[PDB]
Design an enzyme around this catalytic site. Structure first.
Site, PDB file in Angstrom:
ATOM      1  N   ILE A  26       0.790  -1.220   0.000  1.00  0.00           N
ATOM      2  CA  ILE A  26       0.000   0.000   0.000  1.00  0.00           C
ATOM      3  C   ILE A  26       0.827   1.278   0.000  1.00  0.00           C
ATOM      4  O   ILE A  26       0.409   2.297  -0.552  1.00  0.00           O
ATOM      5  CB  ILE A  26      -0.960   0.048   1.199  1.00  0.00           C
ATOM      6  CG1 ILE A  26      -0.187  -0.067   2.507  1.00  0.00           C
ATOM      7  CG2 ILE A  26      -2.000  -1.044   1.063  1.00  0.00           C
ATOM      8  CD1 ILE A  26      -1.030   0.143   3.744  1.00  0.00           C
ATOM      9  N   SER A  28       5.158   3.076   0.489  1.00  0.00           N
ATOM     10  CA  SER A  28       6.608   2.928   0.441  1.00  0.00           C
ATOM     11  C   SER A  28       7.222   4.247   0.865  1.00  0.00           C
ATOM     12  O   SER A  28       6.708   5.315   0.538  1.00  0.00           O
ATOM     13  CB  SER A  28       7.076   2.588  -0.981  1.00  0.00           C
ATOM     14  OG  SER A  28       8.476   2.374  -1.025  1.00  0.00           O
ATOM     15  N   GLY A  29       8.333   4.177   1.583  1.00  0.00           N
ATOM     16  CA  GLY A  29       8.982   5.392   2.031  1.00  0.00           C
ATOM     17  C   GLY A  29      10.487   5.349   1.891  1.00  0.00           C
ATOM     18  O   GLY A  29      11.021   4.760   0.955  1.00  0.00           O
ATOM     19  N   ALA A  30      11.165   6.007   2.821  1.00  0.00           N
ATOM     20  CA  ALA A  30      12.613   6.057   2.823  1.00  0.00           C
ATOM     21  C   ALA A  30      13.124   5.030   3.810  1.00  0.00           C
ATOM     22  O   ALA A  30      14.158   4.407   3.592  1.00  0.00           O
ATOM     23  CB  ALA A  30      13.089   7.459   3.211  1.00  0.00           C
ATOM     24  N   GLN A  31      12.387   4.859   4.901  1.00  0.00           N
ATOM     25  CA  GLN A  31      12.791   3.905   5.917  1.00  0.00           C
ATOM     26  C   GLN A  31      12.138   2.523   5.821  1.00  0.00           C
ATOM     27  O   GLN A  31      12.560   1.593   6.514  1.00  0.00           O
ATOM     28  CB  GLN A  31      12.596   4.496   7.312  1.00  0.00           C
ATOM     29  CG  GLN A  31      11.163   4.776   7.699  1.00  0.00           C
ATOM     30  CD  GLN A  31      11.041   5.208   9.148  1.00  0.00           C
ATOM     31  OE1 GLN A  31      10.587   6.313   9.445  1.00  0.00           O
ATOM     32  NE2 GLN A  31      11.479   4.348  10.059  1.00  0.00           N
ATOM     33  N   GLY A  32      11.135   2.374   4.959  1.00  0.00           N
ATOM     34  CA  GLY A  32      10.490   1.081   4.843  1.00  0.00           C
ATOM     35  C   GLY A  32       9.291   0.973   3.927  1.00  0.00           C
ATOM     36  O   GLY A  32       8.700   1.970   3.519  1.00  0.00           O
ATOM     37  N   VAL A  34       5.461  -0.372   3.268  1.00  0.00           N
ATOM     38  CA  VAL A  34       4.246  -0.625   4.038  1.00  0.00           C
ATOM     39  C   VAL A  34       3.255  -1.506   3.278  1.00  0.00           C
ATOM     40  O   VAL A  34       2.915  -1.232   2.122  1.00  0.00           O
ATOM     41  CB  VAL A  34       3.547   0.701   4.451  1.00  0.00           C
ATOM     42  CG1 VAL A  34       2.516   0.441   5.535  1.00  0.00           C
ATOM     43  CG2 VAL A  34       4.569   1.725   4.936  1.00  0.00           C
ATOM     44  N   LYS A  49       4.655  -2.250   8.441  1.00  0.00           N
ATOM     45  CA  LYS A  49       5.745  -1.509   7.826  1.00  0.00           C
ATOM     46  C   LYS A  49       7.063  -2.221   8.158  1.00  0.00           C
ATOM     47  O   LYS A  49       7.336  -2.539   9.319  1.00  0.00           O
ATOM     48  CB  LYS A  49       5.757  -0.072   8.363  1.00  0.00           C
ATOM     49  CG  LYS A  49       6.825   0.824   7.766  1.00  0.00           C
ATOM     50  CD  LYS A  49       6.879   2.123   8.544  1.00  0.00           C
ATOM     51  CE  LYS A  49       7.802   3.140   7.919  1.00  0.00           C
ATOM     52  NZ  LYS A  49       7.887   4.326   8.826  1.00  0.00           N
ATOM     53  N   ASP A 145       7.892  18.489  11.141  1.00  0.00           N
ATOM     54  CA  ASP A 145       7.991  17.892   9.816  1.00  0.00           C
ATOM     55  C   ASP A 145       6.693  17.281   9.293  1.00  0.00           C
ATOM     56  O   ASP A 145       6.707  16.299   8.554  1.00  0.00           O
ATOM     57  CB  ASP A 145       9.144  16.885   9.761  1.00  0.00           C
ATOM     58  CG  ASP A 145       9.548  16.517   8.338  1.00  0.00           C
ATOM     59  OD1 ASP A 145       9.273  17.290   7.390  1.00  0.00           O
ATOM     60  OD2 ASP A 145      10.155  15.440   8.163  1.00  0.00           O
TER      61      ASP A 145
HETATM   62  N1  LIG Z   1      -1.213   2.759   9.188  1.00  0.00           N
HETATM   63  C1  LIG Z   1      -1.258   3.027   7.814  1.00  0.00           C
HETATM   64  N2  LIG Z   1      -2.419   2.826   7.155  1.00  0.00           N
HETATM   65  C2  LIG Z   1      -2.548   2.994   5.841  1.00  0.00           C
HETATM   66  N3  LIG Z   1      -1.566   3.370   5.040  1.00  0.00           N
HETATM   67  C3  LIG Z   1      -0.337   3.600   5.675  1.00  0.00           C
HETATM   68  C4  LIG Z   1      -0.120   3.447   7.114  1.00  0.00           C
HETATM   69  N4  LIG Z   1       1.200   3.764   7.397  1.00  0.00           N
HETATM   70  C5  LIG Z   1       1.820   4.097   6.238  1.00  0.00           C
HETATM   71  N5  LIG Z   1       0.916   4.006   5.212  1.00  0.00           N
HETATM   72  C6  LIG Z   1       1.178   4.558   3.920  1.00  0.00           C
HETATM   73  O1  LIG Z   1       2.443   4.273   3.353  1.00  0.00           O
HETATM   74  C7  LIG Z   1       3.018   5.524   2.918  1.00  0.00           C
HETATM   75  C8  LIG Z   1       4.486   5.622   3.354  1.00  0.00           C
HETATM   76  O2  LIG Z   1       4.599   5.163   4.724  1.00  0.00           O
HETATM   77  P1  LIG Z   1       5.600   5.774   5.710  1.00  0.00           P
HETATM   78  O3  LIG Z   1       5.309   5.330   7.108  1.00  0.00           O
HETATM   79  O4  LIG Z   1       5.360   7.245   5.947  1.00  0.00           O
HETATM   80  O5  LIG Z   1       7.019   5.398   5.167  1.00  0.00           O
HETATM   81  P2  LIG Z   1       8.216   6.364   5.461  1.00  0.00           P
HETATM   82  O6  LIG Z   1       9.429   5.585   4.901  1.00  0.00           O
HETATM   83  O7  LIG Z   1       8.352   6.659   6.979  1.00  0.00           O
HETATM   84  N6  LIG Z   1       7.880   7.656   4.642  1.00  0.00           N
HETATM   85  P3  LIG Z   1       8.639   8.957   4.274  1.00  0.00           P
HETATM   86  O8  LIG Z   1       7.850  10.147   4.882  1.00  0.00           O
HETATM   87  O9  LIG Z   1       8.789   9.033   2.715  1.00  0.00           O
HETATM   88  O10 LIG Z   1      10.123   8.955   4.809  1.00  0.00           O
HETATM   89  C9  LIG Z   1       2.166   6.656   3.570  1.00  0.00           C
HETATM   90  O11 LIG Z   1       2.085   7.806   2.712  1.00  0.00           O
HETATM   91  C10 LIG Z   1       0.762   6.020   3.625  1.00  0.00           C
HETATM   92  O12 LIG Z   1       0.131   6.090   2.323  1.00  0.00           O
HETATM   93 MG   LIG Z   2       7.101   8.505   7.443  1.00  0.00          MG
END
Ligand SMILES: Nc1ncnc2c1ncn2[C@@H]1O[C@H](COP(=O)(O)OP(=O)(O)NP(=O)(O)O)[C@@H](O)[C@H]1O
Ligand SMILES: [Mg+2]
Ligand SMILES: [Mg+2]
EC number: 2.7.11.24
Length: 346
Positions: A26, A28-32, A34, A49, A145
């Site tokens: 669903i 994707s980010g920088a640290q993991g 999801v 995640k 942030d």
């Molecule tokens: N509990 C959740 N429920 C539904 N979608 C989720 C949830 N947590 C994360 N996601 C989604 O996954 C995306 C990226 O997750 P995220 O936790 O923010 O990864 P991240 O690596 O920490 N992100 P970033 O801000 O790029 O460094 C988010 O924009 C949401 O669309």
């Molecule tokens: Mg995040």
């Protein structure tokens, strides 16, 4: 008889507990990465995640360790809750990954920005952000942030904030979003509680305009976009800047600035009904009080919650909910591994 199993999601391999069924990527980010999943034990869907090797660097390590500690202590309906934590590795030596399991939401604030919201939903979402941010502030957490990507919503218009913010070299393939950072972060100045009000205003303004307010390649192009619209800040704000920064801002081309009805016209607000005409003025009035460059002239969280466009949802239990070791430190990558493991394994 192994408690875990492994499925290939996207490009990575997710090794989760057997209770977590059917993984759908669903986010994707920088640290993991999801994934959304079904939890047989709890009989409900969750979001998993995966922090791939969180201890690989001090930034990612500080981040992981801090979120893990707070997602457990902080307890508010507008701040994402942690349901379960786990690692498929048996020993500290084998330790590689961490899996954060949280309640599943339906989408991002980025997806909500792409749609026309009514005044009822917009002010409720906004009221929730300020509700969580207020809770965080009482706990000693000043985010700094907030961005749409880290704010999640459900279909019934319920909202939750994902991360805990800022506590930094990163050799990564991906970008960092600066668009929602306050001047007292772009220009390095020293902040206070209301630094998050600026991010809230950048979000509201985008929820209305449907496009990013202050974009830019660097903080140079971004500050350009801040003064181009709101105008060059008063000569009382500049005397608070560092002498090397003060020089840069003062010697930058001057702007008188646009007014809010011009920045956010009635065309962007639903102003058909008489109810919508008044709400469209109120909304614009809040924006005008959030998107202020000088923190001393910028509205507080408590006052933004008492504003007529937001207070129509005020609730003592949600706003003034009760808040809860000194964590803003320094360690090596194997010391962080140890700290993360002993946290994952309470
Ligand atoms: N509990 C959740 N429920 C539904 N979608 C989720 C949830 N947590 C994360 N996601 C989604 O996954 C995306 C990226 O997750 P995220 O936790 O923010 O990864 P991240 O690596 O920490 N992100 P970033 O801000 O790029 O460094 C988010 O924009 C949401 O669309
Ligand atoms: Mg995040
Ligand atoms: Mg994110």
């Amino acid at each position: 008889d192994n408690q875990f199993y492994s499925v290939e999601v996207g490009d990575s391999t997710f090794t989760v507990l057997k209770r977590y069924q059917n993984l759908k990527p669903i986010g994707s980010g920088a640290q993991g990465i999801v994934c959304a999943a079904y939890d047989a034990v709890l009989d409900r869907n969750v979001a998993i995640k995966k922090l791939s090797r969180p201890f690989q660097n001090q930034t990612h390590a500080k981040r992981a360790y801090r979120e893990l500690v707070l997602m457990k202590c902080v307890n508010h309906k507008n701040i994402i809750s942690l349901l379960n934590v786990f690692t498929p590795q048996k020993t500290l030596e084998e330790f590689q990954d961490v899996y954060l399991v949280m309640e599943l939401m339906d989408a991002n604030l980025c997806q909500v920005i792409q749609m026309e919201l009514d005044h009822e939903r917009m002010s409720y979402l906004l009221y929730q952000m300020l509700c969580g941010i207020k809770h965080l502030h009482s706990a000693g957490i000043i985010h700094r942030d907030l961005k749409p990507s880290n704010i999640v919503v459900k279909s019934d218009c319920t909202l939750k904030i994902l991360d805990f913010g800022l506590a930094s070299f990163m050799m990564t393939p991906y970008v960092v979003t600066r668009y929602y950072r306050a001047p007292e972060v772009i220009l390095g100045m020293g902040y206070k509680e209301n630094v998050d009000i600026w991010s809230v205003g950048c979000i509201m303004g985008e929820m209305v305009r449907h496009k990013i307010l202050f974009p830019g390649r660097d903080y140079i192009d971004q500050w350009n976009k801040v003064i181009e619209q709101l105008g060059t800040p008063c000569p009382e704000f500049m005397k608070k800047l560092q002498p090397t920064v003060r020089n840069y801002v003062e010697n930058r081309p001057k702007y008188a600035g646009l007014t809010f009805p011009k920045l956010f016209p009635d065309s962007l607000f639903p102003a058909d009904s008489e109810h919508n005409k008044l709400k469209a003025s109120q909304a614009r009035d809040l924006l005008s009080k959030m998107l202020v460059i000088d923190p001393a002239k910028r509205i507080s969280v408590d006052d933004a919650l008492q504003h007529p466009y937001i207070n129509v949802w005020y609730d003592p239990a949600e706003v003034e909910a009760p808040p809860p070791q000194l964590d803003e430190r320094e360690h090596t990558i194997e010391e962080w591994k140890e700290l993360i493991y002993k946290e994952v394994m309470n």
